[PDB]
Structure 1
């Protein structure tokens, strides 16, 4: 009996940059054709959400952010075939339309229907399902998970195992899959290799997990916050370095440590300077560097192309290279079979209503992932 009707619920609206979220009532329209309305159960706080607040990641405001989440289908629009009411789902911030050249390519995952490259903050049909104070509110990457209910396009949701613990598997919606995929699928880390991981947050820890899973012999965590080192070691870093401890630039320090440069490096921070540092620290003839961090809006890095000419490979990826709708349910199934751990990422749990405290935790450096429960 909410099917076909507007739902009034609480969401965290961001009206302005650099301000707290406003927990307040919104109206959520029912799903149109090929849309899905989801009752949220749990959502994680990803740095990319914070980037919306800071202006690092530009997307139209006002907005309902959130993109790392899981919930339960409340209703489906006309013509939906891939989920039903009552299904456990994870919203897919990178869609999988299944029809575009990228979806059809064996390697590609950054589906042409994404709202990340040139964000509009809408549904696929260019409109919004959200009203607050009588004003339309933008969506974020097609997911908008900081709301008790959201509406997503069908291509931006995956059905997952009905017995899944949603307060854990929400991390498969972003941080875990992004970092793990970046190591295992994008870099294709090899047995016995030396890896350097720049940034030891939720995503960088997942990178580490991926490097360890792939059989790396050495995994060097790099962070200016030495509080991050203990957990990085727990999940597989063999050693951790703080650039602030050294007189020399850290690329030189890592090249020394690795007797001439690492096999694989990862930038999991979002700074221009560290993207160049991470490239430079990989071995000049055969090293691979993967950019994971989201850079500040519209800013260009500067680098010497001789870093590449010698033989380095530089690449980046969204969501760990995973084709999202195919991969997310498999990732869940693998989690249920204990093929990887999510608890090491979860440092704090809060009710949704304490979302701003969650953000304070991230900004302070204290948390890895805070999971909010609805």
Structure 2
């Protein structure tokens, strides 16, 4: 019915920074060559979406935000070969073009067609598929999932198992994969190792799941909020520490606990002043520290490079280091085989039209993840 025609639907438009989302009637254009229009099924609310609201993730406004989601293909443009109408799909906020120097590299995943480094808020062709009362609305990270229908470039969508429960596997689009890959792909946590995870939100919980899957002997969760500890232990933490409970700095506490430093540390907080702590607690000769979270308006930190000169490695990644289009379908197949659970991450489910309530849950710290259902 709808192929080749404009669809009128509802979307959450952000007209201006520091305002609530507005549920608007929007027009969604049909897909052009190598583009895919998706009926959204479920979308998560992630911190990066809230950073758009706060104006600390700078991207052009007005905008349809949302980047962690799952849906069903409504139609495909000319030349699309990797998905068909009816297929379940996850939009990829980190694309996989397959052609740039990063996509061709065995260890790179931050494809040069991404819209995260210098956001333009468009499709790959420099235009938008959304209007509201005639006014063009920007895309966000090539995804724009806070809409009943979106249009994405082929390089920014993966086909997934037809039997997938979309209201769970949407987390594979951002938070789960970010944390899980930080452990299994970026750090390559080893069997028998000791890990420290700084921050026990949904992404840090996913980091734990990854360390556990990799066979870590010890997984030390670190959070200032002791309410986060029970879920951390449920998904794999062997122990949890609150820096506020100790009369010395937590890097010293962790180095003592680990008999001279941990094998792997992960920084999973949108804060600067915890990053050098996380680096320093790994063993000085062979420890590895991974940066997963950063504040959005990120300033410089202060550190002593002798922390690296002894043999430490410090690295980060986007999207868990996973080549996105190769990996997302594989992560879904693993979920279907019960290799990991997503239910512990999902604290709240709301209809889409309650998007503002979902953000209020995020800002208050009450949610791990809220999933919006269309």
> Partners in 1 of 2:281 and 2:229 — Cα distance?
20
**CA displacement 1:224-275 (0-9 Å, x = unmatched):** 1111111011001111112222232222221222122111001111211112
Question: CA 1:128/1:316 → structure 2, altered by over 3 Å: closer, same or farther?
Answer: same
| Structure 1: gaps of 5 or more residues | none
* Conserved 8 A contact 1:13-1:24: yes
Answer with 50-59 or 121-130: which moved more: 50-59
TM-score under structure 1 normalisation? 0.98
Distance across 2 between alignment mates of 1:92 and 1:352: 20
**CA 1:331–1:251: 2 relative to 1, 3 Å:** same
Instruction: Provide the rounded CA distance (Å) in 2 between the counterparts of 1:367 and 1:132.
Output: 31
Show structure 2 runs of 5+ residues with no match: none
Could you tell me how far 1:298 is from its partner in structure 2? 4.8
Residue 128 in 1 paired to residue 94 in 2? Answer: no
- 1:57/1:294 contact within 8 Å kept: no
The CA distance in 2 between the partners of 1:221 and 1:363, in whole Å, is: 22
| Residue 119 of structure 1, CA deviation | 1.0
Mapped partners of 1:24, 1:340: distance in 2: 37
Query: In the alignment, is the contact (CA less than 8 A) between 2:49 and 2:65 conserved in 1?
Result: yes
Contact kept? 1:13, 1:21, Cα under 8 Å? yes
Alpha-carbon distance in structure 2 between the residues aligned to 1:139 and 1:259: 49
Cα deviation for residue 294 of structure 1 reads: 3.2
Question: What SS does structure 2 have at the residue aligned with 1:279?
Answer: helix
- Secondary structure at the counterpart of residue 348 of structure 1: strand
Conserved? CA contact 2:221–2:232, under 8 Å: yes
CA distance, structure 1, for counterparts of residue 326 and residue 294 of structure 2: 24
Compute the displacement of 1:158 (Å): 0.5
SS at match of 2:219: strand
Partners in 2 of 1:60 and 1:249 — Cα distance?
41
* 268-277 or 229-238, larger mean C-alpha shift: 268-277
Name the residue aligned to 1:307: 307
Query: 2:36, 2:152 within 8 Å by CA — same for their partners in 1?
Result: yes
Contact 2:272-2:294 within 8 A present in 1 as well: no
Size of the alignment, in residue pairs?
374
Matched residues in 1 for 2:370 and 2:193: separation?
Answer: 32
Counterpart Cα distance in 2 of 1:345 and 1:245: 26
Give SS of 1:103's match.
coil
Measured after TM superposition, the shift of residue 365 of structure 1 is: 1.2
Report the alpha carbon displacement of residue 146 of structure 1 after superposing the two structures with TM: 0.6
Query: Which string of whole-angstrom CA distances, capped at 9 and with x for unpartnered residues, describes residues 128-163 of structure 1?
Result: 111123221111110010100000000000011111
Q: CA deviation at 1:110?
A: 0.7
Q: What residue in structure 2 maps to residue 255 of structure 1?
A: 255
**RMSD in angstroms over aligned alpha carbons?**
1.1
Q: What do residues 105-132 of structure 1 show as CA deviations (whole Å, max 9, x unaligned)?
A: 1111111101111111111111111112
User: Any runs of at least 4 consecutive aligned residues in structure 1 with deviations exceeding 3 A, and if so which?
Assistant: none
In 1, the alpha carbon distance for the partners of 2:45 and 2:307 equals 35
